[PDB]
Amino acid sequence: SAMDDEYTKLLHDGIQPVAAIDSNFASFTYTPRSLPEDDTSMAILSMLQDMNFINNYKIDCPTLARFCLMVKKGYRDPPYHNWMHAFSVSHFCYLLYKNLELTNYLEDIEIFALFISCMCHDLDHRGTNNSFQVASKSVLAALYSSEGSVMERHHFAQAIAILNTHGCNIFDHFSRKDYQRMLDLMRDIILATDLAHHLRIFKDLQKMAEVGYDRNNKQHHRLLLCLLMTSCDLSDQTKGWKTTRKIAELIYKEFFSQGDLEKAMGNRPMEMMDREKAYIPELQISFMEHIAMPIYKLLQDLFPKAAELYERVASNREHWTKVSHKFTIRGLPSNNSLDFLD
Numbered sequence: 572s573a574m575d576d577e578y579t580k581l582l583h584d585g586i587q588p589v590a591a592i593d594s595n596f597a598s599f600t601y602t603p604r605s606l607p608e609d610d611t612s613m614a615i616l617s618m619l620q621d622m623n624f625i626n627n628y629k630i631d632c633p634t635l636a637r638f639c640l641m642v643k644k645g646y647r648d649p650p651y652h653n654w655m656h657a658f659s660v661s662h663f664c665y666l667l668y669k670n671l672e673l674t675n676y677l678e679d680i681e682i683f684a685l686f687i688s689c690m691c692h693d694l695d696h697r698g699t700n701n702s703f704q705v706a707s708k709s710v711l712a713a714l715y716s717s718e719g720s721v722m723e724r725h726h727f728a729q730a731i732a733i734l735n736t737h738g739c740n741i742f743d744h745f746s747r748k749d750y751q752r753m754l755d756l757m758r759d760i761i762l763a764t765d766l767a768h769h770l771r772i773f774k775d776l777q778k779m780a781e782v783g784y785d786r787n788n789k790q791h792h793r794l795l796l797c798l799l800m801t802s803c804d805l806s807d808q809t810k811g812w813k814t815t816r817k818i819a820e821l822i823y824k825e826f827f828s829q830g831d832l833e834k835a836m837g838n839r840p841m842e843m844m845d846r847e848k849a850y851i852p853e854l855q856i857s858f859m860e861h862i863a864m865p866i867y868k869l870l871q872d873l874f875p876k877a878a879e880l881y882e883r884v885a886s887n888r889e890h891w892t893k894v895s896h897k898f899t900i901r902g903l904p905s906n907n908s909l910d911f912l913d
């Protein structure tokens with residue numbers, strides 16, 4: 572009944588102007604995690620309206636309201652991979668549309684699929700990675716481990732199950748060809764959120780940046796969609812230090828919870844998931860240097876207006892160096908006690 576009343580208001584109250592959400596809502600400096608969670612489904616509609624996808628694709632408003640609420644309801648509440656992650660990832664997609672002139676690179680339907688994919692891309696995440704599904708012999712691994720990207724395949728399958736729920740298929744009036752196009756795009760984009768996939772295609776992304784984006788090259792469209800998706804997925808790191816500090820808190824809470832479960836199974840966790848071994852400043856510096864910074868450098872190489880995003884990620888990486896010494900205990904602990912030695 573709670574979703575029913577939320578649905579009723581979403582459908583009948585009208586779609587709030589995007590500027591009424593926040594005055595800096597369309598700026599790379601806005602932090603969408605500042606938005607109260609109760610306001611996020613409306614914000615999704617506002618962004619879809621502002622990009623004109625509602626009118627352009629003649630999206631049925633009742634269906635879209637039900638769809639957005641079902642997607643929100645499809646996220647659990649682990650520390651990091653929750654609906655507020657999917658919301659903030661979607662917002663960054665909107666920022667890319669508002670700031671980077673994506674219409675010069677991608678078709679309308681590709682940009683629309685990118686945004687919907689962002690909303691759906693971690694659906695039903697349980698706060699554990701792909702390796703854990705295999706090691707724990709989960710249902711998800713039984714289904715998908717032969718193909719790889721276990722969780723991402725599950726995320727995609729959940730998105731399709733929402734579309735296949737009566738009253739939720741926002742695409743069900745598309746032509747057969749456009750429908751098939753949309754769902755194929757969603758498969759490719761959601762699967763691209765597997766960082767193992769990013770690392771596999773990285774050289775192809777570099778080669779595309781070096782030779783120059785060819786809008787007539789269908790492989791270039793596919794590569795760019797992957798890079799944009801990954802850029803949305805990591806976009807917390809493009810905000811201010813306080814955002815990235817909090818996000819590291821959430822990541823390691825989730826990781827360490829997985830590691831505790833692996834130890835309870837008799838398995839040595841990855842260092843970054845072992846709360847007895849993980850040295851967070853070193854791990855964050857490694858993540859930023861080897862994964863996050865090269866991604867936003869590629870984005871800047873392709874979109875010069877994205878330079879400020881890379882500079883922020885670089886600044887945040889240098890900040891981890893500046894605070895690393897605070898992970899060393901100088902003097903006595905606050906309680907003046909050495910009890911923690913035992």
Ligand SMILES: Cc1cc([C@@H]2CN(C(=O)c3ccc(F)c(Br)c3)CC(F)(F)C2)n2ncnc2n1
Pocket residue numbers: 766804805806807808818819822843854855857858862
């Ligand atoms: C926005 C953001 C997102 C993630 C993670 C990165 N991911 C990893 O696998 C990972 C790989 C190598 C590492 F060194 C580490 Br640390 C983690 C996947 C994920 F967990 F889904 C989200 N991190 N991680 C640390 N700061 C982050 N900021």
Ligand SMILES: [Mg+2]
Pocket residue numbers: 692693764765
């Ligand atoms: Mg994911």
Ligand SMILES: [Zn+2]
Pocket residue numbers: 656660692693764804
């Ligand atoms: Zn994600």
